[PDB]
Symmetry: C2
Protein backbone atom coordinates (compact mmCIF):
# COMPACT_ATOMS: atom_id res chain seq x y z
CA UNK A 1 0.00 0.00 0.00
CA UNK A 2 1.27 3.48 -0.95
CA UNK A 3 1.01 4.72 2.68
CA UNK A 4 2.43 1.71 4.47
CA UNK A 5 5.99 0.76 5.04
CA UNK A 6 7.47 -2.27 3.36
CA UNK A 7 10.88 -3.83 2.59
CA UNK A 8 11.25 -2.06 -0.80
CA UNK A 9 10.11 1.39 -1.99
CA UNK A 10 8.51 2.22 1.33
CA UNK A 11 11.38 1.10 3.59
CA UNK A 12 12.62 4.67 4.23
CA UNK A 13 9.89 6.83 5.79
CA UNK A 14 10.96 10.12 4.21
CA UNK A 15 11.05 8.65 0.70
CA UNK A 16 7.64 6.99 1.25
CA UNK A 17 6.11 10.24 2.55
CA UNK A 18 7.50 12.29 -0.34
CA UNK A 19 6.25 9.74 -2.91
CA UNK A 20 2.85 9.63 -1.27
CA UNK A 21 2.47 13.41 -1.44
CA UNK A 22 3.55 13.53 -5.08
CA UNK A 23 1.08 10.75 -5.96
CA UNK A 24 -1.78 12.65 -4.31
CA UNK A 25 -0.77 15.88 -6.09
CA UNK A 26 -0.72 14.10 -9.47
CA UNK A 27 -4.04 12.30 -8.96
CA UNK A 28 -6.98 13.28 -11.10
CA UNK A 29 -9.27 12.35 -8.24
CA UNK A 30 -10.00 15.41 -6.09
CA UNK A 31 -10.66 13.05 -3.12
CA UNK A 32 -7.02 11.83 -3.14
CA UNK A 33 -5.91 13.93 -0.20
CA UNK A 34 -9.17 13.30 1.61
CA UNK A 35 -8.67 9.54 1.36
CA UNK A 36 -5.20 10.05 2.86
CA UNK A 37 -6.44 12.22 5.71
CA UNK A 38 -7.53 10.98 9.16
CA UNK A 39 -10.69 11.78 11.07
CA UNK A 40 -9.04 14.53 13.17
CA UNK A 41 -7.48 16.36 10.22
CA UNK A 42 -6.89 20.14 10.46
CA UNK A 43 -6.55 22.06 7.16
CA UNK A 44 -5.55 25.55 6.06
CA UNK A 45 -5.41 27.20 2.64
CA UNK A 46 -5.48 30.81 1.38
CA UNK A 47 -9.21 30.90 0.80
CA UNK A 48 -10.41 29.98 4.30
CA UNK A 49 -11.07 32.52 7.01
CA UNK A 50 -10.17 29.88 9.63
CA UNK A 51 -8.96 26.30 9.50
CA UNK A 52 -11.21 23.40 8.57
CA UNK A 53 -11.51 20.80 11.32
CA UNK A 54 -12.39 17.15 10.86
CA UNK A 55 -12.47 14.75 7.95
CA UNK A 56 -16.12 15.12 7.07
CA UNK A 57 -15.73 18.87 6.81
CA UNK A 58 -12.62 18.46 4.73
CA UNK A 59 -14.44 16.02 2.44
CA UNK A 60 -17.30 18.47 1.93
CA UNK A 61 -14.82 21.26 1.23
CA UNK A 62 -12.89 19.19 -1.35
CA UNK A 63 -16.14 18.09 -2.99
CA UNK A 64 -17.15 21.71 -3.39
CA UNK A 65 -14.06 22.92 -5.15
CA UNK A 66 -13.51 20.24 -7.74
CA UNK A 67 -9.85 21.19 -7.99
CA UNK A 68 -8.02 19.77 -11.01
CA UNK A 69 -4.49 18.64 -10.39
CA UNK A 70 -1.75 20.79 -11.82
CA UNK A 71 -0.70 20.07 -15.41
CA UNK A 72 2.73 19.54 -13.81
CA UNK A 73 4.55 20.53 -10.65
CA UNK A 74 8.00 20.72 -9.13
CA UNK A 75 8.40 19.81 -5.49
CA UNK A 76 11.41 21.75 -4.23
CA UNK A 77 13.61 20.58 -1.43
CA UNK A 78 11.10 18.38 0.47
CA UNK A 79 12.10 17.80 4.10
CA UNK A 80 10.72 15.03 6.28
CA UNK A 81 11.27 15.20 9.98
CA UNK A 82 10.42 11.87 11.66
CA UNK A 83 9.57 11.59 15.35
CA UNK A 84 8.24 8.25 16.51
CA UNK A 85 4.79 7.98 14.90
CA UNK A 86 4.87 11.39 13.16
CA UNK A 87 6.39 12.55 9.90
CA UNK A 88 6.42 16.30 9.17
CA UNK A 89 6.75 16.99 5.48
CA UNK A 90 7.60 20.50 4.36
CA UNK A 91 8.22 21.73 0.82
CA UNK A 92 7.87 24.43 -1.71
CA UNK A 93 5.85 23.69 -4.84
CA UNK A 94 5.87 25.24 -8.28
CA UNK A 95 2.45 24.28 -9.65
CA UNK A 96 1.56 24.84 -13.27
CA UNK A 97 -2.03 25.18 -14.45
CA UNK A 98 -3.00 26.55 -17.92
CA UNK A 99 0.46 28.07 -18.59
CA UNK A 100 0.81 29.93 -15.25
CA UNK A 101 2.84 29.06 -12.18
CA UNK A 102 1.51 29.25 -8.66
CA UNK A 103 4.24 28.91 -6.03
CA UNK A 104 3.25 27.31 -2.75
CA UNK A 105 4.46 26.60 0.75
CA UNK A 106 3.25 23.38 2.31
CA UNK A 107 3.36 21.65 5.67
CA UNK A 108 1.85 18.20 6.00
CA UNK A 109 1.87 16.21 9.22
CA UNK A 110 1.44 12.47 8.77
CA UNK A 111 0.76 10.07 11.64
CA UNK A 112 1.45 6.36 11.72
CA UNK A 113 -1.68 4.84 13.18
CA UNK A 114 -1.81 1.51 14.98
CA UNK A 115 -2.70 -0.32 11.71
CA UNK A 116 0.58 0.97 10.24
CA UNK A 117 -0.99 3.34 7.75
CA UNK A 118 0.42 6.85 7.58
CA UNK A 119 -2.44 9.35 7.39
CA UNK A 120 -2.51 13.15 7.16
CA UNK A 121 -3.59 14.87 10.40
CA UNK A 122 -2.63 18.44 9.39
CA UNK A 123 -2.27 20.31 6.17
CA UNK A 124 -1.22 23.96 5.68
CA UNK A 125 -1.03 25.39 2.19
CA UNK A 126 0.02 29.01 1.60
CA UNK A 127 1.22 31.08 -1.31
CA UNK A 128 4.83 32.12 -1.63
CA UNK A 129 4.97 35.89 -1.11
CA UNK A 130 1.36 36.59 -2.05
CA UNK A 131 1.63 40.35 -1.29
CA UNK A 132 5.48 40.47 -1.75
CA UNK B 1 0.21 9.03 36.62
CA UNK B 2 2.23 5.77 36.35
CA UNK B 3 2.84 5.88 32.55
CA UNK B 4 4.36 9.36 32.87
CA UNK B 5 6.47 8.03 35.72
CA UNK B 6 7.94 5.11 33.78
CA UNK B 7 8.64 7.61 30.92
CA UNK B 8 9.93 10.44 33.22
CA UNK B 9 7.47 12.85 31.58
CA UNK B 10 5.46 15.56 33.41
CA UNK B 11 1.83 15.00 34.53
CA UNK B 12 0.83 18.14 32.58
CA UNK B 13 -2.11 19.00 30.35
CA UNK B 14 -0.09 19.00 27.10
CA UNK B 15 -2.51 21.04 25.01
CA UNK B 16 -2.81 23.77 27.67
CA UNK B 17 0.95 23.82 28.16
CA UNK B 18 1.67 24.09 24.42
CA UNK B 19 -0.87 26.89 24.01
CA UNK B 20 0.71 28.72 26.96
CA UNK B 21 4.23 28.40 25.43
CA UNK B 22 3.02 29.82 22.13
CA UNK B 23 1.14 32.72 23.74
CA UNK B 24 4.21 33.50 25.91
CA UNK B 25 6.50 33.59 22.87
CA UNK B 26 4.07 35.74 20.90
CA UNK B 27 3.78 38.33 23.66
CA UNK B 28 7.45 38.10 24.80
CA UNK B 29 9.54 41.20 25.21
CA UNK B 30 12.46 39.11 23.85
CA UNK B 31 12.41 39.35 20.08
CA UNK B 32 14.40 36.10 19.90
CA UNK B 33 11.78 34.18 21.99
CA UNK B 34 10.78 31.93 19.11
CA UNK B 35 14.40 31.20 18.24
CA UNK B 36 15.03 30.14 21.84
CA UNK B 37 11.94 27.94 21.72
CA UNK B 38 12.99 26.27 18.42
CA UNK B 39 15.19 23.23 17.85
CA UNK B 40 18.25 22.82 15.66
CA UNK B 41 16.27 21.16 12.82
CA UNK B 42 13.52 23.74 12.67
CA UNK B 43 11.79 24.46 9.37
CA UNK B 44 10.00 27.82 9.02
CA UNK B 45 7.66 29.51 6.55
CA UNK B 46 6.10 32.96 6.51
CA UNK B 47 4.65 35.16 3.77
CA UNK B 48 7.84 37.07 3.13
CA UNK B 49 10.04 34.15 2.18
CA UNK B 50 10.73 32.93 -1.29
CA UNK B 51 11.73 29.49 0.04
CA UNK B 52 11.47 27.90 3.46
CA UNK B 53 14.02 28.48 6.21
CA UNK B 54 15.92 25.38 7.29
CA UNK B 55 17.82 25.08 10.49
CA UNK B 56 18.11 27.09 13.61
CA UNK B 57 21.06 29.11 12.39
CA UNK B 58 19.05 30.36 9.38
CA UNK B 59 16.08 31.03 11.64
CA UNK B 60 18.32 33.00 14.04
CA UNK B 61 19.75 35.11 11.21
CA UNK B 62 16.24 35.91 9.97
CA UNK B 63 14.94 36.81 13.44
CA UNK B 64 17.94 39.04 14.12
CA UNK B 65 16.52 41.39 11.47
CA UNK B 66 12.96 41.48 12.78
CA UNK B 67 11.46 43.85 15.25
CA UNK B 68 9.30 41.83 17.58
CA UNK B 69 6.82 41.50 19.06
CA UNK B 70 4.80 43.19 16.29
CA UNK B 71 1.71 43.65 18.49
CA UNK B 72 0.80 44.29 22.10
CA UNK B 73 -2.59 42.80 21.46
CA UNK B 74 -3.72 39.67 19.63
CA UNK B 75 -6.53 37.09 19.82
CA UNK B 76 -5.76 33.34 19.40
CA UNK B 77 -8.70 31.72 17.65
CA UNK B 78 -9.75 28.05 18.26
CA UNK B 79 -6.35 26.69 19.10
CA UNK B 80 -6.15 22.94 18.64
CA UNK B 81 -3.38 20.67 19.83
CA UNK B 82 -3.01 17.20 18.37
CA UNK B 83 -0.77 15.03 20.55
CA UNK B 84 1.16 12.02 19.22
CA UNK B 85 3.66 10.58 21.57
CA UNK B 86 6.58 13.07 21.57
CA UNK B 87 4.90 15.51 19.10
CA UNK B 88 2.28 18.20 19.62
CA UNK B 89 0.78 19.89 16.56
CA UNK B 90 -0.64 23.32 17.46
CA UNK B 91 -2.92 24.96 14.93
CA UNK B 92 -4.70 28.27 15.33
CA UNK B 93 -5.77 31.51 13.77
CA UNK B 94 -4.46 34.77 15.18
CA UNK B 95 -5.79 38.32 14.95
CA UNK B 96 -2.69 40.61 15.53
CA UNK B 97 -3.53 44.25 16.30
CA UNK B 98 -0.75 46.54 15.00
CA UNK B 99 -1.61 49.92 16.68
CA UNK B 100 -4.58 50.86 14.39
CA UNK B 101 -4.31 47.84 11.97
CA UNK B 102 -5.05 44.12 12.27
CA UNK B 103 -3.27 41.24 10.62
CA UNK B 104 -5.18 37.95 10.45
CA UNK B 105 -2.97 34.86 10.48
CA UNK B 106 -3.08 31.09 10.04
CA UNK B 107 -0.47 29.16 12.04
CA UNK B 108 0.81 25.63 12.34
CA UNK B 109 3.49 24.92 14.95
CA UNK B 110 4.94 21.45 15.48
CA UNK B 111 6.55 20.95 18.94
CA UNK B 112 8.71 17.97 19.85
CA UNK B 113 9.42 16.84 23.37
CA UNK B 114 13.16 16.37 23.83
CA UNK B 115 14.66 13.81 26.28
CA UNK B 116 15.03 16.59 28.86
CA UNK B 117 11.21 17.06 28.75
CA UNK B 118 11.49 20.39 27.00
CA UNK B 119 9.06 21.00 24.16
CA UNK B 120 10.78 22.68 21.23
CA UNK B 121 9.45 23.96 17.93
CA UNK B 122 10.58 21.88 14.95
CA UNK B 123 8.27 23.47 12.35
CA UNK B 124 6.52 26.82 11.99
CA UNK B 125 4.16 27.87 9.20
CA UNK B 126 2.68 31.37 9.34
CA UNK B 127 0.36 32.53 6.55
CA UNK B 128 -2.08 35.39 6.01
CA UNK B 129 -5.79 34.72 6.18
CA UNK B 130 -7.31 35.20 2.71
CA UNK B 131 -4.50 37.44 1.40
CA UNK B 132 -6.10 37.64 -2.06
CA UNK B 133 -9.52 38.74 -0.77
Amino acid sequence: QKNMENKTLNENIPEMIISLEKEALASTDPMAFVELSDTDVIYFDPSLETKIEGLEQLRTYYKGMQLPPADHFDMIRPVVQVAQNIAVLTFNLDSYLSDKVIKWNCTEVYRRNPDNQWKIIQTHWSYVKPLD
